[PDB]
Short mmCIF file of C-alpha atoms in Angstrom, two decimals:
data_model
loop_
_atom_site.label_atom_id
_atom_site.label_comp_id
_atom_site.label_asym_id
_atom_site.label_seq_id
_atom_site.Cartn_x
_atom_site.Cartn_y
_atom_site.Cartn_z
CA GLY A 500 14.74 -36.13 1.63
CA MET A 501 13.35 -39.89 1.21
CA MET A 502 15.80 -40.87 -1.02
CA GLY A 503 18.50 -39.34 1.74
CA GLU A 504 16.25 -41.98 3.63
CA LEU A 505 17.07 -44.93 1.51
CA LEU A 506 20.39 -44.42 0.85
CA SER A 507 21.23 -44.29 4.09
CA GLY A 508 19.76 -47.30 5.23
CA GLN A 509 17.85 -45.60 7.52
CA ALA A 510 14.26 -46.52 5.19
CA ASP A 511 13.80 -49.37 3.66
CA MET A 512 10.98 -48.98 1.46
CA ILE A 513 9.19 -45.96 -0.12
CA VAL A 514 5.28 -46.74 -0.31
CA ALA A 515 4.52 -43.68 -1.67
CA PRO A 516 3.35 -42.28 -5.42
CA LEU A 517 6.76 -41.57 -6.73
CA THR A 518 6.82 -40.07 -10.41
CA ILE A 519 9.16 -42.03 -12.10
CA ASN A 520 12.85 -40.18 -12.29
CA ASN A 521 15.76 -41.38 -14.77
CA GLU A 522 18.28 -39.82 -12.13
CA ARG A 523 16.50 -41.66 -8.74
CA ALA A 524 16.10 -44.87 -11.32
CA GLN A 525 20.15 -44.42 -11.42
CA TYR A 526 20.14 -44.50 -7.96
CA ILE A 527 16.54 -46.53 -6.25
CA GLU A 528 14.96 -48.16 -8.94
CA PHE A 529 11.11 -48.65 -9.45
CA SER A 530 8.64 -51.21 -9.68
CA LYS A 531 6.02 -51.56 -12.28
CA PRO A 532 4.15 -48.05 -11.69
CA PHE A 533 0.39 -47.37 -10.79
CA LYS A 534 -0.79 -44.40 -12.39
CA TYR A 535 0.13 -42.97 -16.09
CA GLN A 536 -0.35 -39.36 -15.31
CA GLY A 537 1.56 -35.94 -15.22
CA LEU A 538 1.55 -32.47 -14.44
CA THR A 539 -1.75 -30.51 -14.01
CA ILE A 540 -2.42 -26.90 -13.09
CA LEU A 541 -4.94 -25.08 -10.78
CA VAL A 542 -5.90 -22.13 -12.41
CA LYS A 543 -8.70 -20.06 -10.04
CA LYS A 544 -12.42 -20.34 -10.83
CA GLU A 545 -13.47 -16.71 -11.77
CA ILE A 546 -16.77 -15.18 -10.03
CA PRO A 547 -19.61 -14.51 -12.27
CA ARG A 548 -20.94 -10.84 -13.48
CA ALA B 649 -31.65 -8.49 -29.33
CA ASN B 650 -28.74 -6.38 -26.92
CA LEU B 651 -30.67 -8.68 -24.03
CA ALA B 652 -29.40 -11.74 -26.34
CA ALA B 653 -26.12 -10.07 -26.96
CA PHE B 654 -24.64 -8.90 -23.87
CA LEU B 655 -26.07 -12.02 -22.37
CA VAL B 656 -24.81 -14.92 -24.55
CA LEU B 657 -21.99 -13.33 -26.20
CA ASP B 658 -18.32 -12.63 -24.99
CA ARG B 663 -6.48 -18.31 -19.25
CA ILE B 664 -3.79 -20.04 -18.27
CA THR B 665 -3.31 -23.39 -20.76
CA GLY B 666 -0.04 -24.56 -19.89
CA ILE B 667 3.83 -23.84 -20.49
CA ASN B 668 2.99 -23.02 -23.71
CA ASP B 669 1.52 -19.59 -22.64
CA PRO B 670 3.46 -16.27 -23.10
CA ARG B 671 2.84 -15.78 -19.19
CA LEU B 672 5.09 -18.97 -18.90
CA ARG B 673 7.42 -18.48 -22.05
CA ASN B 674 7.83 -14.62 -20.81
CA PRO B 675 7.24 -15.13 -16.89
CA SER B 676 6.17 -11.98 -15.45
CA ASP B 677 6.09 -10.25 -11.55
CA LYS B 678 2.31 -10.20 -11.48
CA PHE B 679 2.48 -14.12 -12.56
CA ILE B 680 4.97 -15.69 -9.76
CA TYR B 681 4.18 -19.20 -9.41
CA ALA B 682 5.87 -21.93 -7.36
CA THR B 683 6.08 -25.56 -5.68
CA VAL B 684 7.72 -27.58 -2.96
CA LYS B 685 11.55 -27.65 -2.81
CA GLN B 686 13.13 -30.91 -2.60
CA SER B 687 10.45 -32.30 -4.85
CA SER B 688 10.31 -34.40 -8.26
CA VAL B 689 8.69 -31.75 -9.71
CA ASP B 690 11.44 -29.75 -9.11
CA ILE B 691 13.48 -32.03 -11.02
CA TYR B 692 11.29 -32.41 -13.63
CA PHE B 693 11.83 -28.47 -14.15
CA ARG B 694 15.31 -28.56 -13.30
CA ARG B 695 16.03 -31.49 -16.32
CA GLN B 696 14.28 -29.50 -18.89
CA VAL B 697 16.56 -26.32 -20.53
CA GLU B 698 13.85 -23.94 -22.02
CA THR C 749 -6.03 -26.57 -16.68
CA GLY C 750 -3.83 -28.15 -19.29
CA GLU C 751 -2.38 -31.56 -20.01
CA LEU C 752 -0.57 -34.05 -18.18
CA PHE C 753 3.16 -32.40 -18.11
CA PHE C 754 5.64 -35.08 -18.02
CA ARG C 755 3.87 -38.10 -18.50
CA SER C 756 5.93 -40.84 -16.31
CA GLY C 757 4.39 -43.15 -13.96
CA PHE C 758 4.10 -43.66 -10.23
CA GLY C 759 6.00 -46.09 -8.91
CA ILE C 760 7.40 -47.70 -5.61
CA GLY C 761 10.88 -46.58 -3.98
CA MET C 762 12.87 -49.98 -4.42
CA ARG C 763 16.44 -50.19 -3.84
CA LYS C 764 18.15 -52.11 -7.01
CA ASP C 765 19.59 -55.49 -4.60
CA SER C 766 15.98 -55.81 -3.47
CA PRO C 767 14.89 -59.41 -4.40
CA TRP C 768 10.85 -58.83 -4.56
CA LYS C 769 10.93 -56.22 -7.31
CA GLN C 770 9.82 -59.63 -9.10
CA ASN C 771 6.03 -61.00 -7.49
CA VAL C 772 5.53 -57.16 -6.66
CA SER C 773 5.64 -56.31 -10.04
CA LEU C 774 3.52 -59.25 -11.20
CA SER C 775 0.95 -58.19 -8.16
CA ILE C 776 1.03 -54.60 -10.17
CA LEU C 777 0.17 -56.33 -13.60
CA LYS C 778 -2.72 -58.48 -11.50
CA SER C 779 -4.07 -54.63 -10.30
CA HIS C 780 -4.19 -53.68 -13.71
CA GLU C 781 -5.53 -56.54 -15.30
CA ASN C 782 -8.16 -57.80 -12.62
CA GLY C 783 -8.86 -53.91 -11.93
CA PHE C 784 -7.63 -53.37 -8.61
CA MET C 785 -6.68 -50.16 -10.18
CA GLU C 786 -10.30 -50.05 -10.65
CA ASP C 787 -11.12 -50.85 -7.10
CA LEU C 788 -8.91 -48.39 -5.85
CA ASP C 789 -10.83 -45.72 -8.38
CA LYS C 790 -13.87 -46.49 -6.59
CA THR C 791 -12.98 -46.81 -3.39
CA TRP C 792 -10.98 -43.39 -2.71
CA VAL C 793 -10.63 -41.75 -6.39
CA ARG C 794 -14.49 -41.32 -7.66
CA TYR C 795 -16.67 -40.29 -5.07
CA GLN C 796 -16.98 -36.08 -5.38
CA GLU C 797 -18.04 -33.32 -7.91
CA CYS C 798 -19.00 -29.76 -8.02
CA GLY D 744 -17.53 -36.78 -39.89
CA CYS D 745 -16.61 -38.56 -36.40
CA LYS D 746 -20.29 -39.75 -35.26
CA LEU D 747 -18.88 -42.95 -34.60
CA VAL D 748 -18.13 -42.56 -30.42
CA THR D 749 -15.71 -45.15 -28.87
CA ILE D 750 -15.92 -46.16 -25.04
CA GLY D 751 -16.94 -42.69 -23.06
CA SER D 752 -14.45 -39.93 -23.42
CA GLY D 753 -11.04 -41.50 -22.73
CA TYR D 754 -12.56 -44.34 -20.16
CA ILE D 755 -9.85 -46.95 -20.33
CA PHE D 756 -11.30 -50.70 -19.19
CA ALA D 757 -8.46 -53.05 -18.16
CA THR D 758 -6.23 -50.36 -16.77
CA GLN D 766 14.18 -61.78 -23.94
CA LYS D 767 15.22 -62.36 -20.13
CA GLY D 768 18.57 -60.95 -19.23
CA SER D 769 19.36 -58.78 -21.85
CA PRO D 770 22.01 -56.01 -20.19
CA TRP D 771 19.56 -53.67 -22.34
CA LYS D 772 17.09 -52.86 -20.55
CA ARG D 773 18.94 -50.31 -18.27
CA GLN D 774 19.60 -48.73 -21.52
CA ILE D 775 16.63 -48.74 -22.69
CA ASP D 776 14.57 -47.47 -19.88
CA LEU D 777 17.06 -44.62 -19.01
CA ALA D 778 16.55 -43.61 -23.00
CA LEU D 779 13.02 -43.94 -22.56
CA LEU D 780 12.85 -41.40 -19.35
CA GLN D 781 15.16 -39.00 -21.66
CA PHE D 782 12.82 -38.98 -24.11
CA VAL D 783 9.82 -38.73 -21.84
CA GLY D 784 12.09 -36.10 -19.92
CA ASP D 785 12.19 -34.23 -23.50
CA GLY D 786 8.62 -35.09 -25.07
CA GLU D 787 10.02 -36.74 -28.21
CA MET D 788 7.13 -38.78 -27.76
CA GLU D 789 4.84 -35.97 -27.80
CA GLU D 790 6.11 -35.07 -31.27
CA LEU D 791 5.65 -38.21 -32.94
CA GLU D 792 1.99 -37.86 -31.11
CA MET E 496 5.93 -61.92 -31.04
CA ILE E 497 6.00 -63.99 -28.31
CA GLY E 498 7.18 -67.26 -30.80
CA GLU E 499 9.81 -65.09 -32.52
CA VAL E 500 11.08 -63.92 -28.81
CA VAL E 501 10.87 -67.44 -26.95
CA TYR E 502 12.48 -69.34 -29.73
CA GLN E 503 14.91 -66.07 -30.79
CA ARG E 504 13.43 -66.05 -33.73
CA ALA E 505 13.09 -62.01 -33.37
CA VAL E 506 16.05 -61.48 -30.05
CA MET E 507 14.51 -57.75 -29.98
CA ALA E 508 11.05 -57.14 -30.37
CA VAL E 509 8.92 -53.68 -30.25
CA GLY E 510 5.34 -53.57 -31.91
CA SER E 511 2.51 -51.83 -30.36
CA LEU E 512 3.07 -54.98 -27.40
CA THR E 513 0.52 -54.89 -24.54
CA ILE E 514 2.61 -55.91 -21.70
CA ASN E 515 0.15 -58.22 -19.87
CA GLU E 516 1.05 -60.72 -16.79
CA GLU E 517 1.12 -63.57 -18.69
CA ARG E 518 3.09 -61.95 -21.31
CA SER E 519 5.54 -60.92 -18.47
CA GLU E 520 5.41 -64.42 -16.78
CA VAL E 521 7.06 -65.50 -20.38
CA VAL E 522 8.98 -62.24 -21.53
CA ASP E 523 10.37 -59.38 -20.26
CA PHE E 524 9.11 -56.10 -21.01
CA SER E 525 10.57 -52.26 -20.74
CA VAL E 526 8.78 -49.11 -19.75
CA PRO E 527 5.40 -48.31 -20.93
CA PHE E 528 6.27 -45.90 -23.65
CA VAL E 529 2.56 -45.37 -25.10
CA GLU E 530 -0.14 -45.09 -22.94
CA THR E 531 -3.02 -47.96 -23.87
CA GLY E 532 -5.49 -49.84 -22.47
CA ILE E 533 -9.17 -51.49 -23.68
CA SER E 534 -11.49 -48.65 -24.98
CA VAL E 535 -15.06 -49.12 -26.31
CA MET E 536 -15.83 -47.22 -29.69
CA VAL E 537 -19.26 -46.73 -30.84
CA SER E 538 -21.18 -44.15 -32.95
#
């Protein structure tokens, strides 16, 4: 994917909301991050009685 | 009193649920492959 | 529902030999300090409810 | 009693050089956040 | 903290140090490990 595109020379920048990954930082090092967030969960809205 | 009761009286919260600690087939969940989210899944052991 | 699972930051895909980690991250510090993060909070994030 | 209400419901405003330790420290912090031991301290 | 870093009294310094842009001009910093910012406490 995007990792394969930077590591092949095809892409030179990923300007995208990339979560900080340790293994990705072992190859492709982030700048200072934008948003200090995490995974959340979509749960359905139940219908009323 | 019953009209007050049966109108005023009596979910998935996260990984700590037994719905995810013991994941069932009535509760199947998914992501998109080749994502960083699946990386965060594949890193942890539990 | 649930908390922020795996609390990381949203960074930029930058190669290791890229010399412009520096002033870009300085602009990131400016975005946090001068509220350009809050400017994108106004201009794209905070509009809608139910 | 906790009647002392801070700013909002968590609405936060305002959102050594050359050490080789930096890679070690930052990959270690990726390991700890990936393991959630900071959450254990929390 | 910055006086001990620059003058190398504290070669390493951890603290609850706000990574400021002015401080990043002077001192390098690690990853953020605790989320923070400016909040307002009221009754």
